[PDB]
Structure 1
Amino acid sequence: ALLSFERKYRVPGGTLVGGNLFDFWVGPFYVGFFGVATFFFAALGIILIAWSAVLQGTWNPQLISVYPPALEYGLGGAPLAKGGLWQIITICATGAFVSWALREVEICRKLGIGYHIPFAFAFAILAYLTLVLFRPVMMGAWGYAFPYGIWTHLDWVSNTGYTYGNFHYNPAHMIAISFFFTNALALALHGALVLSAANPEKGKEMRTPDHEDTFFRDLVGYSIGTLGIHRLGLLLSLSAVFFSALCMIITGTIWFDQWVDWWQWWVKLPWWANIPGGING
């Protein structure tokens, strides 16, 4: 149940809460206090999603949907069959995510590595809380959050996007999309480059980081370096999530019209607004 090198790393300590009360492993998983919390919240959320499937009347996993309370309920509680289950599952999900991050903190402390992984997960948790907690609270209703269904939260995304015309024109959305695309491109390039260095042409020696830098300089004239590429990947993903959270937190709170109407400000600058010709003239 242990890797060939895991034995020397399984030592007491690093726990945030509980000392040695939960300082143990179940199979490969390290439990800890926050692991106990994460498992409880996850099991409760999954069982409540199954129960909401029972209440809804469908067992098809793609049709299972846990809708938030309707806008009539505001930010208060709702009956479980009509929005309260969504609130409980949201609380369970937030608890599970935060417990997962803190369990990762405990594992980082035990292994003596930096806290970059829980810190990066905190960004995803913040984007989730923007979608389910911060934005609905700012707008004043839990019905502005998305349902917990495989294809119904896509309906939420579609309706929220088309509320503001074409959502492509949200500028923070544009920045987040560019970050996402660049992150996917950089991940493809990085995986491919490391694999090409480590799996060269058959019968040839394994390559070195010098070969990787030479390849990318001969390709695009610049090489960011191994440390550089890993920093870039982390920053691209985190910036994408940060700007998506920003785009959703400004939408419906400080912006209410179509976003192309936002883009009209550049067109109507005084020195070229009235010039005929072009597209907006």
Structure 2
Amino acid sequence: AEYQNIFTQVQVRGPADLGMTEDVNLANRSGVGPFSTLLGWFGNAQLGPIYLGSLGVLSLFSGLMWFFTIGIWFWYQAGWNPAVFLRDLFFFSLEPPAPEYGLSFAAPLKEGGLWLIASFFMFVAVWSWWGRTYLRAQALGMGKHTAWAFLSAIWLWMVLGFIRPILMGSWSEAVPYGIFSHLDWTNNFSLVHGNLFYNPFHGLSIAFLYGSALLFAMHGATILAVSRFGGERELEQIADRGTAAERAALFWRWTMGFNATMEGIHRWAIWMAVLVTLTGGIGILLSGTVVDNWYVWGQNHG
């Protein structure tokens, strides 16, 4: 049985690694967490330290308030009965105001008001978390690639819960907070707009979603295949190309006629993934604002 480097044979441990400092405010770093042998079969064993400034505490607090707002309404729907809570966990749902309240904030607590409170907490949690991804990178001097990429995910979410409800004229267009209900909403969204398979941006969205699995299977497999030449040490392979990066390039050149570089492959990777939600958010945003029925639309602009 030849070794494949999917799981570690021998873990080694040393002093807890406290990190690079650069311009980080060390007073906002926690201590180091425990070490997980379980995780160390696959990745790093070290947990922590985490950084927790004001933005991070703000974000964690609104995020929990969002969760807890949903969870209290779920208990209400359960008549406070724990067995009913567990039984119907996936059927509960915190739903937005009815269409007649438009974009207003008048709707009663039990009829959409609570949804707007939860959504407000979610809005603050995500946007403050975005600021973290930018600021943590700044403090280390790194590029802002993570924060720009996160913006693409935030785009689709903003379009679903905020920008399209506003453009459409009522909060009732937004997504409800519930396991099965948000699946019901999704199916219903497609039916009401004439089958999203005719939305050309849904098709692009799928291509990139499939493509991300294609590309990560490729990239992940490639790096593991050349990890016998230290291939996963990618930053130094960029600064000083090794035989790992050359064999990786030549596998793909010989297989399909062209290839990447150790750096360039990561530009393929960031854009494959980012375009999923980019084209996705456009496709949803155009739906009902501009195009009532994608089948109809495709009959004319196909």
Q: TM-score, normalised by structure 1?
A: 0.83
SS at 2:28 equivalent: coil
Q: Is 1:94 matched with 2:123?
A: yes
Displacement of 1:176 after TM fit?
Answer: 1.4
List 4+ stretches of structure 1 deviating above 4 A. none
Name 1:249's counterpart in structure 2: 285
Name 1:271's counterpart in structure 2: none
Name 2:29's counterpart in structure 1: 24
1:97-130 CA distance string (max 9 Å, x none):
1111111222112222111111211111121110
Counterpart AA for 2:73:
S
Cα pair distance change 1:56/1:26, threshold 3 Å: farther
Counterpart AA for 2:92:
I
Q: Is 1:9 matched with 2:20?
A: yes
Contact 1:44-1:92 within 8 A present in 2 as well? yes
Displacement of 1:6 after TM fit?
Answer: 3.8
SS at 2:18 equivalent: helix
1:60-99 equivalences in 2 (<5 Å): 60-77=88-105, 78-99=107-128
Name 1:203's counterpart in structure 2: none
Aligned mate of 1:34, from 48, 55, 79: 55
Inter-partner Cα distance in structure 1 for 2:112 and 2:271? 37
Aligned mate of 2:296, from 258, 261, 270: 261
Cα pair distance change 1:100/1:26, threshold 3 Å: farther
Displacement of 1:47 after TM fit?
Answer: 1.1
Displacement of 1:40 after TM fit?
Answer: 0.8
Aligned mate of 2:246, from 201, 210, 233: 210
| Of 77-86 and 151-160, the range deviating more from structure 2 | 77-86
Name 1:222's counterpart in structure 2: 258
Inter-partner Cα distance in structure 2 for 1:253 and 1:6? 52
Inter-partner Cα distance in structure 2 for 1:216 and 1:90? 46
Inter-partner Cα distance in structure 1 for 2:216 and 2:111? 42
Inter-partner Cα distance in structure 2 for 1:224 and 1:76? 52
Alignment RMSD: 2.3
Contact 1:14-1:106 within 8 A present in 2 as well? no
Aligned mate of 1:177, from 206, 209, 232: 206
Inter-partner Cα distance in structure 2 for 1:266 and 1:42? 42
Q: Which blocks of at least 5 consecutive residues in structure 2 are unaligned? A: 1-13, 33-48, 79-83, 230-241
Displacement of 1:236 after TM fit?
Answer: 1.5
Inter-partner Cα distance in structure 2 for 1:4 and 1:122? 36
Counterpart AA for 1:175:
L
SS at 2:149 equivalent: helix
Aligned mate of 2:75, from 54, 57, 61: 54
Contact 1:55-1:81 within 8 A present in 2 as well? no
Name 1:279's counterpart in structure 2: none
1:203-223 CA distance string (max 9 Å, x none):
xxx961111111111111111
Inter-partner Cα distance in structure 2 for 1:64 and 1:120? 32
What count of residue pairs does the alignment treat as equivalent? Answer: 254
Cα pair distance change 1:177/1:134, threshold 3 Å: same
Cα pair distance change 1:26/1:128, threshold 3 Å: farther
Name 2:9's counterpart in structure 1: none
Displacement of 1:5 after TM fit?
Answer: 7.1
Displacement of 1:174 after TM fit?
Answer: 1.3
Inter-partner Cα distance in structure 2 for 1:216 and 1:162? 42
Inter-partner Cα distance in structure 1 for 2:289 and 2:199? 13
